[PDB]
Amino acid sequence: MNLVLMGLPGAGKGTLGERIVEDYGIPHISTGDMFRAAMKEETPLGLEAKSYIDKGELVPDEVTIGIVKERLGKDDCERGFLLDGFPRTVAQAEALEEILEEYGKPIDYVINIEVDKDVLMERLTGRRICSVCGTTYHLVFNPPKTPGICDKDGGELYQRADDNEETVSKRLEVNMKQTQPLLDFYSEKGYLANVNGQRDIQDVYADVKDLLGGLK
Ligand SMILES: Nc1ncnc2c1ncn2[C@@H]1O[C@H](COP(=O)(O)OP(=O)(O)OP(=O)(O)OP(=O)(O)OP(=O)(O)OC[C@H]2O[C@@H](n3cnc4c(N)ncnc43)[C@H](O)[C@@H]2O)[C@@H](O)[C@H]1O
Ligand SMILES: [Mg+2]
Ligand SMILES: [Zn+2]
Known part of the structure; x- marks a missing residue:
């Protein structure tokens, strides 16, 4: 059960993922959390990522792909994993394909959580x-x-x-322009799944879990 969760800022990836990790026992790997956790501990990674995160911009591909490659190689990803927030660029998607091809753990499904951009500011500020x-x-x-x-x-x-107005705006802006290419990339691959993320939290999960049977 190798999953990738994608969605615009505030679409509900973490809310969804929390769930999935409790029900299936696959590690929840959020690049955002990892970066966060780094900024907290003031690690060299945290300090470099902070610049981009505080501005709502994307952290460079090179360093990001690097931390995701190491994480996915962990003992806990033996039966699968839940990627959250990675990839969010085509280059990261292509990079991920080789890493998994190396680990022999190809993606089962990329779950896109569709939420209209005009309601995400409300979700994030609140x-x-x-x-x-x-x-x-x-x-x-x-x-x-x-x-x-x-x-x-x-x-x-x-x-x-x-989660302040100015930075949410830039985050929506930066990620919206990366969205269609990612959807295209995975639609071509054949394992892109779109879910309506604008319903009660247990309703979105219900749809998601119904794409998870048969995945080991
Ligand atoms: N691969 C990468 N490459 C380069 N840079 C990277 C990177 N990955 C990370 N970064 C950097 O890290 C930064 C932060 O990354 P990240 O933390 O991943 O930012 P994000 O993508 O903006 O996502 P969020 O955590 O803000 O939201 P979410 O989708 O998990 O939503 P949640 O479930 O909380 O839900 C939001 C709110 O909605 C509510 N909610 C949830 N579900 C529902 C529902 N169904 N109905 C109504 N409300 C709901 C929740 O309670 C909550 O209040 C970026 O700005 C970037 O700089
Ligand atoms: Mg999150
Ligand atoms: Zn708590």
């Missing part, structure tokens, strides 16, 4: 994330039971620094 587990909430669409704290562990919630 997003609140748990500082403890990273699970996401939304003030209007899926708020915590007790405002400001995570349902699961009681940890404080925060607002990612790039």
